[PDB]
Design a protein around this ligand. Structure first.
Ligand SMILES: [Cu+2]
Length: 209
């Protein structure tokens, strides 16, 4: 489980998406430190111009790289599922706006960690905040309230994300998440993200006990 996360671990992220007739593929490459809670990644859209702003995809684009304190070692589901891996299912509602439905798989493939993702965008208003590209190239710090799930031997997590509209307004994005381990208590993750193709740096830790 945590045997594999001690030290630097390379990452490969793939994502296929369909949003209002526009399809796109995004590849991500980099590394991650779970002992520190770091994530340095460089995402590239292989279909040219993305029909959707990058910051909306950040949320869906690997929660086993989040830092764990030594008193929450026994609450890190993500690392325990490894190397067998878990499925990352999520639906995302943009208030007064369109919805994502996603499914993804996180596994170890060799010495590198691999995350392939499926994405489907529905009911998005054109010239909106999403299809109009009216969201700023930034991402704030959020709480990710994780809850245990004995019905599916896995994890659920609810949270909503404030995207910053260029008018000074705020676009909300509700997240319902489910995670199920392939094979065989209420805490939360505080995150922090900087947008700098697309480059990212993140620091995420576990708190609430
Ligand atoms: Cu499709």
């Amino acid at each position: 489980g945590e045997e594999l996360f001690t030290g630097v671990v390379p990452i490969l992220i793939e994502l296929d998406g369909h949003v209002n007739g526009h399809c796109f593929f995004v590849r991500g490459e980099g590394e991650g430190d779970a002992t520190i809670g770091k994530l340095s990644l460089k995402f590239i859209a292989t279909t040219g111009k993305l029909p959707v702003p990058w910051p909306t995809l950040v949320t869906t684009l690997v929660q086993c790289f989040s830092r764990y304190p030594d008193h929450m070692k026994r609450h890190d589901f993500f690392k325990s599922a490894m190397p067998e891996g878990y499925v990352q299912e999520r639906t995302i509602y943009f208030k007064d706006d369109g919805t994502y439905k996603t499914r993804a798989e996180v596994k170890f493939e060799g010495d590198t960690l691999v995350n392939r993702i499926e994405l489907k965008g529905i009911d998005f208003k054109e010239d909106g905040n999403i299809l109009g590209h009216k969201l700023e190239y930034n991402f704030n710090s959020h709480k990710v309230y994780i809850t245990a799930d004995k019905q599916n031997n896995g994890i659920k997590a609810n949270f909503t994300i404030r995207h910053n509209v260029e008018d000074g307004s705020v676009q909300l994005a509700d997240h319902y998440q489910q995670n199920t381990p392939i094979g065989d208590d209420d805490h939360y993750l505080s995150t922090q993200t900087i947008l700098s193709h697309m480059v990212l740096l993140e620091y995420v830790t576990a708190a609430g006990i």
